A paper describes a structure:
Kainate receptors, a subclass of ionotropic glutamate receptors, are tetrameric ligand-gated ion channels that mediate excitatory neurotransmission. Each KAR subunit has a multi-domain organization, including the amino-terminal domain (ATD), involved in receptor assembly and trafficking, the ligand-binding domain (LBD) that binds agonists, competitive antagonists and positive allosteric modulators (PAMs), the transmembrane domain (TMD), which forms an ion-conducting channel, and the carboxy-terminal domain, which determines surface expression, synaptic localization and interactions with intracellular proteins. Concanavalin A and BPAM344 inhibit kainate receptor desensitization and prolong activation by acting as a spacer between the amino-terminal and ligand-binding domains and a stabilizer of the ligand-binding domain dimer interface, respectively.
The ConA-bound group of GluK2 particles includes two subgroups, with one or two ConA dimers bound. The type I ConA–LBD contact is mediated by carbohydrates attached to N546, the glycosylation site conserved among GluK1–3 subunits, and the type II contact appears to also involve carbohydrates attached to N751, the glycosylation site conserved over all GluK subunits. Although single N546Q and N751Q substitutions substantially reduced the steady-state currents, dramatic current reduction was only achieved in the double mutant N546Q/N751Q, suggesting the interchangeable capability of carbohydrates attached to N546 and N751 to serve as ConA contact points. Our experiments with mutant GluK2 channels therefore confirmed glycosylation of residues N378, N546 and N751 to be critical for PAM action of lectin ConA on GluK2 receptors.
Numbering used by the authors:
A (entry chain F), B (entry chain E): 1 to 237
The structure:
Amino acid sequence: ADTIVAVELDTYPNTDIGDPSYPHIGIDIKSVRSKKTAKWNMQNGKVGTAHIIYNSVDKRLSAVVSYPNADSATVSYDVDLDNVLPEWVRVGLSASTGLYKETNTILSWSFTSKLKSNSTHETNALHFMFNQFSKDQKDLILQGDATTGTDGNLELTRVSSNGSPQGSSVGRALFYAPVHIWESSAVVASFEATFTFLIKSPDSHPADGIAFFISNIDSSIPSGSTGRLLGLFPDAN
Amino acid sequence: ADTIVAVELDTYPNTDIGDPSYPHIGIDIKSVRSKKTAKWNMQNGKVGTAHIIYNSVDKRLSAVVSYPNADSATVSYDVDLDNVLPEWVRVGLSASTGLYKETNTILSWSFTSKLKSNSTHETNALHFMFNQFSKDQKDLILQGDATTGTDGNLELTRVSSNGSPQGSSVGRALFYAPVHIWESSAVVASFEATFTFLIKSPDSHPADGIAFFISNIDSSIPSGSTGRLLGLFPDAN
Ligand SMILES: [Ca+2]
Ligand SMILES: [Ca+2]
Ligand SMILES: [Zn+2]
Ligand SMILES: [Zn+2]
């Protein structure tokens, strides 16, 4: 398989393979069996605010989710990013669904790497601010059945049936450029993300969530993920 | 031919094809026949400080170069980036020489676009700070005969024969990711650069200059450019 670490904002409680009995936020080191979990409200179509950092002076890998007028879920996990994730990566988004429908609209996304040339000697960035996912955005290598455009939206489903987004839809949003990580020059590359989603209520028990992965520079949709495999896992372990 | 706009930090006076009598800074719209030139010092092996902006609030493609203990050579040309430079681009550096030698050591490089979702609404970036050109940098699709690494350097020559870098060699340094420009979402993307270089005196009348282009998303070394074509124009017109 391909080595990949994601932040599952899972919206079906996958009762048989490791997730809790509630729709949560998790974090995944190569395994859909997660490393932390945290309770999530699951509001209807409301916007977004999720935020993921990792320094290596404090080596916790963090994430929060708060709708505006809602609380935050600090689902931070301590893991050693030294030996778990390859030197040059390809960041981006992954959502899926299967037999249940939900909206996986992303409207904005950002990033900032800062990797330790000689720690003070002017580290390297890849910062962006994608508030405007257009029709013909071409630094995205969006796999699967992802769409974009028509508005400022990134639609990681098969959409526009009145926003009832055609279940067993999987879509990935691999960003174009690579970033140095593994450790080697050490690994304080304090990568940030802003993950402003929209999960509309389709009045249909909405369930499978969007992830935010960091993968190897090569990828595909692994062995089918039309459902609980969450777009990036080949296997349910 | 490839639609291209360069900014020349020329060291060779090309009287025949149209450069003035001294080593100059200039600016190019689809031709080596520049629009404006200015006085540039051309010292020996010293370092670096160049700077290129374009604010469409002011439509000046301004450019200065300073050695420390030197002046600032403004070569700003009125150009409307509306109709001259493609809807998605591929930025990068370009150095070349032919029949004369020069060292074209680049030691750091940067960028910052800021492009107008809805003018205030959180312009998109692509900021990087390459102070750490590695041996195996892979967000560069460096063309020609450019090299990198072994130290923090981006050697746009064939070099290391005591760094007297083996005349008639060309190498460009195309960055990986594109930028939306042409106008379409209007063109206030104030793209900045910082271009810390080092032109060693080879004891051989140092000549052919380094550039800074914003080309099409495809390019090459055009039709052979071992010399006056400055790495990027197919023809001298
Ligand atoms: Ca699920
Ligand atoms: Ca020339
Ligand atoms: Zn889960
Ligand atoms: Zn010139």
